[PDB]
Amino acid sequence: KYSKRIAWMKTTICDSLQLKDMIVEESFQYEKNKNLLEQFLSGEGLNKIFAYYQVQEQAQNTTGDLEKIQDKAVWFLRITNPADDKKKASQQDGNDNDIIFGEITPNTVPMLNALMESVYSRQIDHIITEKIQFAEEEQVLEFQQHSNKFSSEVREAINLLDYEAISGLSESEKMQHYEMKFNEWINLISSQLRKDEKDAGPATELIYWRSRMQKITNWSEQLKSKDFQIVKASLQRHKNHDNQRPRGDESKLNEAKDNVKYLTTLEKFIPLYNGTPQQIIDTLPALMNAIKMIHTTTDKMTGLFIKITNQMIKNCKDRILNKMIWEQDPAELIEVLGSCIKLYCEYKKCYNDTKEKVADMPKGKTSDAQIFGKFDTFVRRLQKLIEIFSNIQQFNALLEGMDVLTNKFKKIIDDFKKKGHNLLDTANNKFDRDWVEFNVEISHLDGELQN
């Protein structure tokens, strides 16, 4: 080796009695490594060789054997000494040339490895928030490499004989208690793998979609545990294939975990926290762009779009209430309602593009209609608010008598806007009762405009 083998063997007499041992002392191994010849020259290779970067300080069952050639050694715990660099520096510490690695020999290695990679991921995430670390598109690719290394760690975390009984395997009490447990597991799995969508919040549908992802993920970790399968091996060995091909087939965790992952992907891709009409339009544009991931059942797509439409309706009512709009000037109310009008115009255009896609799906082949009707009703209500806005602005442009007529029209439109914001169920029921009342109000306004 180099001249600094004093500061490793000392680091060995140090740590070799905390791995290969419950403290005490290290039965001198390097110095009946160093008076046989191969274990001397090998460790000589360790510190000195740029070639042979890694060593291995193996413990085997007490017996010590230093050599780079790795061997899985039960029932041992180890420490590994990889120098890496050429010529062990004798004017520095032997701790600050090597990098220590305590191994478990035939002892929970797939776990210990998974944590070590869970740590290097977190440190890599901490560096990503901080400075250069990784540059530019290179550092952008590095962050893509870490995000993939993170998914492999979560893949590892999810991961975490047959004749070991004898005459205990074949019993009508043991095999029936295992079949009754595997079939009860099937009834529990079926509970997670049918409730109607109805009318839900923007968080509720995305939360239950993400909840199905994590729930079916943790359920897929429960069925990926070797005990839960080596009971399904004991059943297939006993020839009880009625609680065996009946908690795979019936358990629809193959198709439901697929819909769970699809719901998780829709939440990652994706109004209720919008105050201004600019934020209402901006929310509808970001939502309609996020709903393009379609090609990657047509009933499942329609149910998500309906829940996004209902949330945008309850926000527009709350905005019109915030704008006492009989007291507020018609010209001032028109400017605020013009911004809400433009967003309503954008939603009607997106409804026409969805109807053309429905026509193409009807030409190929010789629940979805009621949603298209509720979308047409939502587009119809948004246009009615836009029209009352434009009526107030036109009177401002005009005429003292013309201004007073607009102020009356803006007062009626406000009272309808306040009723909608009160309750979302009231917004559906009162909207129908307001359309009848608005017609009677429009006739009275026309007579005043004629004079």
């Binding site: 905390q18 419950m22 890694q54 290695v109 210990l112 070590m116 290097y120 540059a135 893949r155 590892e156």
Partner: protein, 416 residues
């Protein structure tokens, strides 16, 4: 017994050491740093409750020192032990406790390379007790792709050589040799991805910078050609034979790279002459220059013309012209920014500077000399003028227009 919220600190004093100590406790420095509030409850949740860092940040800026927590984050020579790995506490004193040394400083990458080399040593040895299952070989493949991405990150900071790290090490099924080829595929993509035009797009385009970009490109392909000689192993040839259009597309891209490299090497010989020309300009300390550089420009052009004739097989002779023109372009912009800027604002302020205004016109004249020499070289060339100054030099023309517009207004200020 061993110990508990103390056991971790006791075997932590001995093992750490720093080459020679083996303390075995009692650490008075550790008991004083215990009262961070989060760190103590962290160290207590590691001892008798399986994760506990113990950080040692030396110098730098706002160093952690005797810091760390139980997880948290190190910015720093630390070490994480296990202790009751969910709960094996209040029994045998954390018998599954696993320790590992993590130095300051990448080294975070090199550690990840040793962790994967350990986990592959584990897979070769036992098979596991179903906790790994068949995902043992899948995790080994996930580790290898991580080691490739680390090698790609190495090439990002350093200089490519991804294909060498994409190559499988100590391979004994047929799906594994296919995975090796698929990483070789993204290597050929990185060579074609790199262009002379993309650097020109994102500002820069310096006469020294473009020469260095070809000198870096010719070095990357020369390394890739040397790596291709190691990549093309007798074993890697047999893999391509046993199912093959995946192989020949990687072999075809290699022969295209080898030819483009021969083109790059001639571009590097041309770049090496421009790096001397750029050295004449880059050396400039923004004092005078334009008086002599207007004289030195005509010969710098006369060298570029002779460069066209000498190489002959010079690949991208119409693309390299867009670089040379952008090269002189960026150079003039730098020289011009010096002679005005806050100095021109300061001179206008005092309004006791007329000659300095004339100096600005002289600076513009130096630019005119470069465009005149560019036309004087176009005649000297006699065909294959190319250039496309009417769109390329617009960047330069637009600078001189703004300059002239100031000069027109500065002269009027002297009048008043």
């Amino acid at each position: 017994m061993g110990d508990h919220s103390q056991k971790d600190s006791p075997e932590d004093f001995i093992i750490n050491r720093l080459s020679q100590a083996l303390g075995i406790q009692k650490e008075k420095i550790k008991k004083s740093l215990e009262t961070q509030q989060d760190d103590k409850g962290e160290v207590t949740n590691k001892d008798e409750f399986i994760q506990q860092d113990n950080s040692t940040n030396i110098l730098w800026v706002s160093g952690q020192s005797e810091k760390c927590t139980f997880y948290y984050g190190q910015l720093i020579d630390k070490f994480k032990k296990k202790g009751i790995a969910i709960k094996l506490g209040l029994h045998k004193l954390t018998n599954e406790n696993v320790a590992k040394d993590v130095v300051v400083v990448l080294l975070e990458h090199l550690n990840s390379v040793f962790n994967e080399i350990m986990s592959p040593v584990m897979q070769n040895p036992l098979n596991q007790q179903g906790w790994t299952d068949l995902v043992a070989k899948d995790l080994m493949e996930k580790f290898n792709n991580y080691v490739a991405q680390v090698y790609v990150l190495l090439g990002q900071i350093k200089g490519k050589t991804m294909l060498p790290l994409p190559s499988h090490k100590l391979t004994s099924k047929d799906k594994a040799h296919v995975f090796e080829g698929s990483i070789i595929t993204w290597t050929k993509q990185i060579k074609n991805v790199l262009k002379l035009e993309p650097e020109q797009l994102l500002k820069y385009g310096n006469d020294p910078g473009p020469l260095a970009e070809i000198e870096f490109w010719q070095n990357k392909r020369d390394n890739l050609n040397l790596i291709d000689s190691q990549l093309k192993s007798v074993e890697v040839q047999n893999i391509l034979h046993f199912l093959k259009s995946t192989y020949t597309t990687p072999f075809t891209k290699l022969q295209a790279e080898v030819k483009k490299a021969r083109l790059e090497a001639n571009e590097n010989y041309r770049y090496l002459f421009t790096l001397k020309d750029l050295f004449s300009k880059l050396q400039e300390s923004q004092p005078s220059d334009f008086p002599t550089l207007y004289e030195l420009f005509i010969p710098i052009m006369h060298t570029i013309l002779l460069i066209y004739n000498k190489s002959k097989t010079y690949n991208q002779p119409p693309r390299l012209v867009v670089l040379i023109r952008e090269i002189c372009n960026a150079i003039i912009s730098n020289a011009q920014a010096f002679v005005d800027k806050d100095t021109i604002f300061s001179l206008i302020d005092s309004k006791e500077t007329t000659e300095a205004c004339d100096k600005l016109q002289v600076t513009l004249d130096v630019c005119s000399k470069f465009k005149d020499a560019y036309f004087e070289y176009k005649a000297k060339a006699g065909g294959n003028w190319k250039l496309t100054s009417n769109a390329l030099f617009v960047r330069l023309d637009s600078f001189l227009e703004r300059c002239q517009d100031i000069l027109h207004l500065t002269n009027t200020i002297v009048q008043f």
